[PDB]
């Protein structure tokens, strides 16, 4: 049938995965004749199972979330993703003015955002002040220090969830972008090119924090977001001091604390400075979510969208996910002290840089995160790394 769409999104449990239920069920009331059926994907299945339906766009999802960057691009230049240039509400225009950029390629919208999530540090306050962290650290060095005093205390330091690879390659990216100029960055970035020097030395500065053995120790089958020894599960149970993750993290923990309520101590602080690294300080690196629609669509796909992005939906979705809404007006209301912060960084960046590998697409994203968990697990160098991507970019 016709008013019938298929709805695909990354809300696994919970809350969250009730607010589509719920938005789903308010858009049948509002459009009559329209149901919409969903499934709820965990996030590590999700690239797979849109990328072997959408082969064939007739008999894939109506409704899905974006990979971002890259990764959506790659999917445009197949034909998987309809122009929404024309298409998106004024509400939209409006309300996602600095968000849609992150949806827009070569001039053309491809879809509605309903989050934006800048990564940085989440850590448990309370296990900073058993081990003698009055003040959050500014620079790598002080990060690294902190670490050490953390892990006297008794507690690992940081959680890591290398098993699902990119968490752990995070600390890679986020080196890269501090130790790379703006410029060589957005150049390599864009150009496939990883000659610089600044590449090597970020993952030179990934393999002392690996050196320190300040992780959770089962870091390498640990996952970021599944069951209660994931990384997040680590940190909302106070077994590990802090992880380095997206602005979805407040609403990932509060699913995985006791009590399934917020995480009472949690804090927030940007990835800090590193000495001798030439990236604009403060640049901000992140996440926008979107949801795009399949170019063999009809038009309840397309209004289903849109009203996502209706302002009492967005601040709905911001109380549901815990998490920052794509929408400037429905971030009023926003309570949570770190994604208080977080805002306050947003307002005042002059860039965010897409998720590295979502920036460099399938490929050299794989072949990155991989590479980084090689030399993580002691199999693998700073040098390593940059021969993935090398290696992998011939491809295209
Ligand atoms: O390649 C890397 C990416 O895969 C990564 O993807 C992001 C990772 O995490 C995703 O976050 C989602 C968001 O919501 C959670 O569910 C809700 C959380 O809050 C609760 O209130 C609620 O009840 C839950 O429904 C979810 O579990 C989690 O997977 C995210 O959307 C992806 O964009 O980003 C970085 C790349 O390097």
């Given at each position: 049938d016709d008013k019938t769409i298929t709805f695909w999104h990354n809300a696994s449990a919970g809350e969250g995965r009730q607010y589509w239920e719920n938005?789903?069920?308010?858009?049948?009331?509002?459009?009559?004749?329209?149901?919409?059926?969903?499934?709820?994907?965990?996030?590590?299945?999700?690239?797979?199972?849109?990328?072997?339906?959408?082969?064939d766009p007739a008999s894939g999802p109506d409704v899905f979330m974006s990979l971002g960057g890259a990764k959506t691009k790659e999917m445009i230049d197949a034909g998987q993703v309809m122009d929404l240039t024309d298409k998106i509400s004024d509400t939209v225009k409006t309300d996602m003015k600095t968000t849609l950029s992150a949806a827009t390629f070569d001039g053309k919208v491809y879809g509605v955002p309903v989050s934006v999530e800048p990564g940085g540090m989440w850590y448990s306050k309370?296990?900073?002040?058993?081990?003698?962290?009055?003040?959050?650290?500014?620079?790598?060095?002080?990060?690294?220090?902190?670490?050490?005093?953390?892990?006297?205390?008794?507690?690992?330091?940081?959680?890591?969830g290398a098993k699902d690879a990119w968490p752990a390659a995070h600390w890679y990216y986020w080196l890269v972008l501090r130790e790379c100029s703006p410029e060589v960055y957005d150049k390599s970035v864009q150009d496939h090119d990883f000659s610089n020097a600044c590449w090597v030395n970020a993952g030179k500065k990934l393999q002392e924090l690996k050196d320190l053995k300040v992780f959770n120790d089962g870091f390498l089958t640990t996952t970021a977001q599944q069951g209660a020894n994931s990384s997040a599960g680590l940190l909302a149970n106070h077994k590990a001091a802090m992880e380095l993750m997206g602005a979805w993290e407040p609403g990932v923990l509060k699913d995985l604390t006791p009590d399934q309520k917020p995480m009472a101590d949690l804090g927030f602080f940007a990835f800090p400075e590193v000495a001798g690294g030439e990236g604009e300080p403060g640049a901000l690196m992140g996440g926008v979510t979107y949801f795009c629609v399949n170019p063999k669509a009809s038009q309840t796909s397309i209004d289903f969208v849109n009203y996502m992005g209706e302002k009492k939906n967005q601040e709905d979705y911001a109380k549901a996910?815990?998490?920052?809404?794509?929408?400037?007006?429905?971030?009023?209301?926003?309570?949570?002290?770190?994604?208080?912060?977080?805002?306050?960084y947003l307002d005042k960046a002059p860039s965010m840089q897409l998720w590295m590998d979502t920036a460099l697409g399938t490929n050299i994203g794989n072949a990155l995160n991989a590479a980084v968990v090689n030399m993580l697990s002691g199999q693998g160098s700073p040098e390593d790394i940059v021969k993935a991507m090398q290696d992998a970019a011939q491809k295209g």
């Open positions: 938005l789903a069920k308010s858009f049948e009331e509002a459009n009559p004749g329209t149901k919409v059926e969903i499934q709820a994907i965990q996030n590590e299945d999700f690239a797979g199972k849109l990328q072997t339906a959408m082969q309370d296990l900073f002040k058993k081990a003698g962290v009055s003040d959050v650290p500014a620079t790598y060095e002080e990060l690294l220090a902190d670490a050490k005093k953390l892990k006297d205390s008794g507690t690992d330091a940081i959680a890591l996910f815990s998490t920052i809404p794509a929408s400037e007006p429905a971030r009023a209301v926003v309570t949570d002290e770190s994604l208080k912060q977080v805002i306050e």
